[model samples]
Target: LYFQSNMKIGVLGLQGAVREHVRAIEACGAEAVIVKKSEQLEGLDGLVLPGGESTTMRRLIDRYGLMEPLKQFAAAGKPMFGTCAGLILLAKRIVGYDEPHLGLMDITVERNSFGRQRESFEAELSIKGVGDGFVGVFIRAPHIVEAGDGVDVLATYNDRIVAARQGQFLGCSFHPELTDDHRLMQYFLNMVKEAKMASSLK
Candidate 1:
């Protein structure tokens, strides 16, 4: 059950950062697929919800009837990662937006906490498992307002939670794919490996 090869990882392709996610997972020695429908969710060893418009992505998920299946898959311990707007979607509670979210992870997020596009900035972030520093691209990024008790804060910016983990779930407010650093993606691959091992043990 080691997930080094032949494992099918999917990138939710209804919105942004689809190809970047595909390339990242493929670089990790896993087969990557673009999942645009609920049927595409099948046979995936792991899934990544890339950075995009959270509300728009939610609408598409509902329109395509993928919300329930994704929720079930995540709840069953499937490895899933969310970045930027994807992080907002996975949050159980959102402070700024009134739209319905996926609520997969128990966290409160504030949308556009970094201000507008003109206010966006880049910085070096010290991510867990990713080591010393990785360039963080903040594009109208959502900030983790609060995380539940079980959630582990992986990385922070200005004392604010920016990356977190809970079981097989990982979330970040910055675009890891936007930079040359592939360590974040590698960390996610490790999550897939850990999940597979845990499942086999059970």
Candidate 2:
């Protein structure tokens, strides 16, 4: 097992609630970094794509030339957790769109599928491996409509896929950092730990 204290998790700081995600990661017993540059990806064991307006966030990513580096980070077999808009960024396909941002994960997503801002709601989610009664806060979230065979569906709300995992990538349609529950972040840390151990063995 890898030492949790030695793990460095980064939250993409271009947009969204970056600080909140950092807090959650630290709460999970891992060091958190607000990554504003692509260089920061090198030292991180894992990365988080925080919730934000996808379009704006995508532009900021491009502006910073972070697109390729992020894909490289994923290609390097590091763990990544994409929350809400972060999920959209990592999806291989986006409904009604031909191109994706990172397109690292093997899932198809529908943006704003949950509802508009006024309709945003919180639900008690029963995420697989995360147990039951985990409250997920939805804010203009994106839901996975289709997942590849490699993807494992994690949680659903209203019969729609809200969370899933494909290898080292974990994604959810809601904001886990918006709430006090840090179990999801902890689960991701475990993924980072396992990946670190496996990499060292190789």
Candidate 3:
């Protein structure tokens, strides 16, 4: 079934690539909302946590009392896509740092495992939906150190897991929104539709 006009997609706008995500969601033919508070979770069909400083994002989210509501939303089968530092926030565990995480995805991440911000680089990635020749922009990105049994490995970088999925949730170590490519965004919207249908059936 096609997602209706009423279906809303939210971009966590407290920080990070909010506009990029909003543009991607709009390109996918969905209503996009910039969410800064828990109340914005009201009618969202999906949410995008864009790349930024994970520790700062965590602190701001906690300060605004969005952590519990975010967890509750994820538990209730809301589709969430997190990239870069956003991926770190969604991780169940993280090494090299002791920051509060949303823990929505059962995986461990290593912050700045690829070196400093200046050391950031790009490479071609082979992803699930966006097959061959996909550019991955890594900017002080976090790498998936470990993944739980439930997670589906999507892509790897230097033999390390960098992208994964668990049910309706998607997490990536690279920034897809930074590029003009919308394959990842489209795939995520499809996941949102699948999730909505699945939840409705339930």
Task: Compare the candidates by lDDT and give the number of the best one.
Answer: 2
Q: How many collisions between residues are there in candidate 3?
A: 0
Per-residue lDDT, model 3, residue 42, is 72
Q: Which regions in candidate 2 have their CA more than 4 angstroms from the true location?
A: 1-5, 14-16, 97-100, 113-118
What does candidate 3's lDDT look like per residue over 1-202, in tens digits? 8744455888886534477777778887888898888988978889988746655676778777888888988988989998888887688887886666778789988888544454879999999766777899988878788899999998998998878999878999888887888888888888888888788898
Residue-by-residue lDDT tens digits, candidate 2, 1-202? 8644579999986435477887888887888888888998999999988746656676678777888899899988999999987888788887764334678888887777433444789999999998889999988887677888988989998888898998999999899998888888889999999999888899
Q: Give the better candidate number (2 or 3) by lDDT.
A: 2
Task: Give candidate 3's error at residue 194 in angstroms.
Answer: 1.0
TM-score of each: 0.89, 0.91, 0.90
Between candidates 1 and 2, the TM-score winner: 2
C-alpha root-mean-square deviation, candidate 1: 2.7
Q: What TM-score number comes out for model 1?
A: 0.89
**TM-score ranking, high to low:** 2, 3, 1
